[PDB]
Symmetry: C3
């Protein structure tokens, strides 16, 4: 019904933003996977075996039956902590992109609303045009029958009347397409939308350029993601270096087994070596490692990290200059919109004066009714142009708010106060 | 040189589809790779060693030589089966992409075929306009040199003539570029192509929108691939829980090793402990292992998989909305084409009257040849626009049917009745 | 100050090209880590272990300690050589993309340079139009005050004045944005730039298309990329087949150990078997293996590699076709530009004549000052067209040289000879 309600529904219905939220959640979950290797480990290895001697070594047999648990726990390894830092950076990146997605959704909802309104206005204008052209065709046909013109004039009138029929059909197709494209965002059919009230339309002047640029350089999203990217590149440089550092880990276990034997040929001159025995082992101990002369395996891995970091630093500079140009362009666009609005208001007044003149002439009997209809068509065209300009101005203010990096739902709340009168999308 | 003969060769010459076929064949053959690990594996293990004890074990020399074979057969580990399921689903996705590429090939070939003929028509119009503009220049120059006209008029006529010459050059270049575009798809240069048979054109009517929507939901390619992706995500979730499952393997090995003992200490009072032996080994056994805690890593992979699944579901919903809006748009486009065809038909009906009236006046002597030529140019304009409208209608029919996903080559009678005598592509 | 200087500054100040260089450096450095697995891989170890396993031996204490080195050196394996070759091919690919980035930088700088002059021309002519329309409004308002026209005609003049005001504002904003976009390439603000020298402009004729095609086949960067990628696919096919051949390795080690026990019960009539030891060993040996049966792993890789090879061949064919098409399209754009230049020259001459006629008529009193202002505006616009045409010709020559694959600073130098007139980028 209103813009606020439409956005409220689209917020909790839209699938793209929900995909962004799901991706953020799955990314925050990778932190747990990062820490897991640090914590202890536990396993089991029970098994069995059967040997056999041959090639003059027959008559000797054995039976293995093992079962043991194992605990492993690392006590010093800096590589693992690098992973946790990197995962935290990834979580930050995901949050930033989620914010960008929300802002994009706000922009798209506003754009769809205003597109629907513009379609309504254009449809009305084309209907008026069709009426005028039909009236003109009737006059020309009536004159030809009377005997004042030739067949070619009637043919031209019919062509002009046929063209407007195609334009009228196209307008309805555009309106239906706009309604469906709004449903694609919101997910619902909206018979009516609130219309702009001209009594309280705002044309406030914007702030200086340098202030806007300075504020944007603080809480913008693209450059924030660039900064986080450079930080994770540095964290990636740290990770590479720790490949040539020693580490320690602890190992523990316990197990039992039975190792009885059997056989006839085994008997004889055993010498106590062929006796059944049961045994267990409970080894526990630490370990250490340290690499040397690896052919610069990790040494050359470090140089790759530094080049990547300088590339990230270059991308950040590119992002900075891009933000500069974008904000400047948005500001100039706002100014152009103001000027265009003024021009269109003047045009509307001129058309109104012409229509009044044409109507008075007809009332006194100096003009036909085709002139009245043509004047009406011109006035409706001017009204459509003015409405389009107003909608573009509102969209541009929202766009500069987005470029600044400070777009929310409370900002859009104010715009709702400019929309008062309901209008049907497909009136009967 | 009709569409069918051009498309038959395009089918077996187009590298865009051939790459898709190669990708599908790579995807399919890859399954046999994933079934390899389950089967048994054999290998050889010969090697050599040499040792020299020190510290307590001084003066002890030894040398060893061994060689054996190994064979491991996985008894129960579903991890490998889930790989097969995932890979077959990947093959399905690839086949869907192949179907999409085939439809794309068909549509692109048809579009290029019509573009060539459109270029030819506009070229003919430009030639007529050039002739008319030249006859105007001659008229003005003769007048000026006899009087009746200032020089500025001569220069204006010269300017118009130069402009039409530039347009003619542009049209020739466009005609060559479109042919080059027709050689880039099919792979052959076509000097002559068939054209539309105007006397047998069909302005058919489309089916209701709801029936198209149902057919699309049932048999559309994009949403089918999306459903395959959703099933793949579920299978991946099933694969995540596979971690907790225990695994066991059956391994058997055999080999020989003949080791001899020597040394001053060994000789003398050996006591049978240091005597040489020539026994073999035929070890056969099993193995079983299962994780107990693992620090909750799998309990995190399970949640990552669930988040991925919900993201895939959101993607599928988005694709559904997209297909709905696309089918609606295509239907509206067909209707718009019908209306435009009617409008242009009336427009050409009208222009014929004026060129007919200009000719009679010259026959009696009320007009000049310049009027006749200008009328001819206008009618040529009415002729080039109508042909463009017809070609657009045909392409839009193909587009709606492609949105339905139901066209590969059943456009046999669709265009066969629409062909006519050959028309050259690059006349000289 | 001028084109050559701007390019010189951008050659080293442009971040995109520097990122490309960083990528090239990363690719070349990668060769080092492919070499590394050939050299010896020395290492160090050390681990204590306490054990009291007592399935049958209760009260036995046996600590353990060890510390040893390691060395490994591969003898025969073609898994590493293939990696070296493939990394070299990747480096070549990176070099080619770097060269492409160079050419892109030159093109972007030239386009950004010419857009500023276009903006200057547009601004001047828009200001002239504003002056003319203001004089028209003054005349109309005076006439209405005198009592010769109706109020309706005043509104039209006011509307036109507002429209021209808006157009002028848009022109100024476009000039500002074009200045900013050139700073996004070089990082500097240019108060003034050099303009074209009209009396020193050349109109050459392009070389025959066959020679251009031959040169493109010789030295087109994208085709070089395609051929290198295909070679990289063939070498990968060779790599896959090499998973069959056997492998040979050499290892060596040396270390110590204590394995000291304790306990009163152990001491006494132990038979010397349970006494503490301080043994040491320096074992060294080789290790060989040759696979026999691996399943479809060996078989499937080769078929997949061949499929990838045919895919690469298809991609190369696409590259060839695209190159030919682009060469012809640029070659034709050149001639189109020549023709447009001729047409706009004629238009300028015609406008000059009209202006002179108007001026003489006003000198003798047959015309109002308003008429003169309009002719000046028409002439001024005619120089907007002719200026924007020559810049298009230069840009098109630069593009065709780029497609030929021979675009260097030497080529860009030839343009600057025609730019020998400074002009401000911000009038008043």
């Amino acid at each position: 019904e209103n813009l606020m309600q439409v956005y409220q529904q689209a917020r909790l219905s839209n699938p793209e933003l929900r995909k962004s939220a799901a991706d953020r959640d799955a990314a925050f979950e990778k932190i747990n996977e990062a820490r897991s290797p640090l914590l202890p480990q536990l396993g089991l290895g029970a098994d069995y075996t059967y040997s056999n001697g041959y090639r003059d070594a027959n008559g000797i047999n054995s039976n293995a039956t093992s079962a043991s648990l194992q605990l492993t726990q690392s006590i010093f390894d800096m590589s693992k902590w690098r992973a946790l830092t990197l995962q935290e950076k990834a979580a930050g990146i995901q949050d930033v992109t989620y914010q960008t997605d929300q802002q994009t959704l706000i922009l798209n909802t506003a754009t769809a609303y205003f597109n629907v309104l513009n379609a309504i206005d254009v449809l009305s204008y084309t209907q008026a045009q069709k009426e005028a052209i039909y009236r003109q065709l009737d006059q020309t046909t009536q004159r030809f029958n009377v005997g004042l013109v030739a067949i070619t004039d009637v043919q031209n009138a019919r062509a002009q009347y046929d063209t407007v029929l195609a334009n009228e059909l196209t307008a309805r197709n555009n309106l239906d397409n706009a309604v469906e494209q709004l449903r694609q965002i919101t997910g619902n059919y909206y018979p009516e939308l609130a219309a702009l009230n001209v009594e309280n339309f705002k044309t406030d002047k914007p702030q200086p350029v340098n202030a806007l640029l300075k504020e944007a350089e603080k809480r913008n999203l693209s450059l924030l993601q660039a900064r986080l990217s450079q930080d994770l590149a540095r964290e990636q440089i740290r990770q590479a270096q720790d490949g040539h550092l020693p580490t320690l880990d602890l190992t523990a276990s316990t197990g039992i087994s039975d190792t009885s034997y059997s056989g006839s040929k085994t008997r004889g001159a055993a010498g106590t070596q062929y006796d059944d025995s049961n045994m267990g082992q409970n080894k526990v101990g630490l370990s250490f490692s340290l690499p040397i002369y690896q052919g610069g395996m990790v040494n050359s891995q470090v140089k790759q990290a530094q080049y990547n970091f300088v590339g990230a630093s270059e991308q950040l500079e590119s992002a900075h200059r891009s933000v500069v140009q974008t904000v400047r362009s948005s500001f100039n666009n706002i100014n152009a919109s103001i000027s265009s609005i003024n021009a269109y208001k003047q045009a509307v007044v001129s058309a109104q004066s012409s229509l009044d003149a044409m109507e008075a002439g007809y009332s006194v009997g100096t003009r036909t009714i085709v002139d009245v209809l043509d004047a009406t068509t011109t006035l409706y065209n001017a009204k459509q142009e003015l409405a389009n300009a107003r909608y573009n101005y509102l969209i541009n203010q929202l766009n500069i708010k987005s470029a600044l990096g400070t777009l929310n739902e409370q900002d859009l709340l104010a715009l709702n106060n400019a929309l008062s009168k309901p209008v049907s999308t497909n009136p009967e």
